[PDB]
UniProtKB/Swiss-Prot annotation, chains A, B:
GO terms for biological process: dTDP-rhamnose biosynthetic process; novobiocin biosynthetic process; polysaccharide biosynthetic process. The record marks 147 as: Participates in a stacking interaction with the thymidine ring of dTDP-4-oxo-6-deoxyglucose. Keywords: Antibiotic biosynthesis, Isomerase. Belongs to the dTDP-4-dehydrorhamnose 3,5-epimerase family. Coiled coil: none annotated. dTDP-6-deoxy-D-xylo-4-hexulose 3-epimerase that acts together with NovU to catalyze the formation of dTDP-4-keto-6-deoxy-5-C-methyl-L-lyxo-hexose from dTDP-4-keto-6-deoxy-D-glucose in the novobiocin biosynthesis pathway, an aminocoumarin family antibiotic that targets bacterial DNA gyrases. GO terms for molecular function: dTDP-4-dehydrorhamnose 3,5-epimerase activity; isomerase activity. This is dTDP-4-dehydrorhamnose 3-epimerase. The gene is novW. CDD domains: cupin_RmlC. Its EC number is 5.1.3.-. One of its GO terms (cellular component) is cytosol. Pathway: Antibiotic biosynthesis; novobiocin biosynthesis. It comes from Streptomyces niveus. The lineage of its organism: Bacteria, Bacillati, Actinomycetota, Actinomycetes, Kitasatosporales. It comes from the Bacteria.
């Protein structure tokens, strides 16, 4: 049969960082395949408070060991993201970059794969990164704003305050992420979102 | 390197059925992976006339030879869909079911795969189906309305007026699609959308 995934009803539950939710899809399987609902406006708008504004949809394909992140968008205008792994498996990480937040400088990892097919929603001011666990992995992202190079920034994914437990011994970083500021450096230059503003 | 896909700017071009467009993504590749924009609200709203309303997002995984379709939603309220193949390859088919349309009872097939990573947008009253070409294939769909069992209907994918050239000798149909009405039967019972209404 190959691996046959678990049947499920949709659920939306908060993670440990305010403004971040994990979505369990509505999923069924039969001998011809698998079908799932991974976003539903009525379920989402009730839980989060408003429908997701679709401004852009993206895909990324990454090889095993690639660590990408921690990326965020300035607030204002902010950007929210709804992320899922459509092929393979990733260790997905959200980072609270909102100065003043109770969970500022905390992170949380979620396994996003093509078996459970969970999604993560992250609100404005939240940073995002991931590590491909599978030999290659494909993420699909729905974003509430379009790409603007003036507002997209990042912090170093090997930052020592975060000390993220990436599931690879040899993280493959792009020049952009290798050269990114430490969290404290970004903070010290006034580059991070403020929790009051994101609220 | 594995297969390295073509770099591209986004394009939206009309197919042969009014209300149906093919989207070429903005895509880049480097040694760590592939990144693409497969929906962009400014590009889309300019071409189609309005931003895509995100009501539901779905995924389907199908084995080779599975033919699914031809499905549509009653108008009103209608439903528009934005479809792409995120893994594998499918022969994707749109069918003009709008009585009175110049292209009523015509179809058009597009290869949606994980190499070119094109998307198809189909407006209200347009039917949709596909055949998995790869051993398994994963489609991702963004829809402007949520699932309502009262409004989702179909016609037989082996209908003789359409005579769709499915790239399999042995189409695997679900009981639902095996039992679906012929196009002329649906028409004769008043079950099809009207072009004036969709307009």
């Amino acid at each position: 049969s190959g691996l046959v995934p678990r049947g499920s009803h949709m659920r939306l539950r908060p993670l440990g960082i305010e403004g971040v939710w994990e979505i369990t899809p509505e999923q069924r399987a039969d001998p011809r395949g698998v079908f799932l609902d991974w976003y539903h406006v009525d379920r989402f708008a009730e839980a989060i408070g408003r429908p997701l504004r679709l401004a852009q949809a993206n895909l990324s394909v990454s090889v095993r060991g690639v660590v990408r992140g921690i990326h965020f968008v300035d607030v204002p205008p902010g950007q929210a993201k709804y992320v899922t792994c459509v092929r393979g498996a990733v260790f997905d990480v959200v980072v609270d970059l909102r100065v003043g937040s109770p969970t500022y400088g905390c992170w949380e990892g979620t396994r996003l794969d093509d078996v459970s097919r969970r999604a993560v929603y992250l609100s404005e001011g939240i940073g995002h990164g991931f590590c491909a666990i599978s030999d290659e992995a494909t993420l699909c992202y729905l974003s509430s704003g379009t790409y603007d190079p003036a507002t997209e920034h990042g912090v170093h994914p090997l930052d020592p305050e975060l000390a993220i437990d990436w599931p690879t011994g040899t993280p493959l970083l792009s020049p952009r992420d290798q050269d990114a500021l430490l969290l404290a450096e970004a903070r010290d230059a006034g580059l991070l979102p403020t929790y009051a503003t994101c609220q």
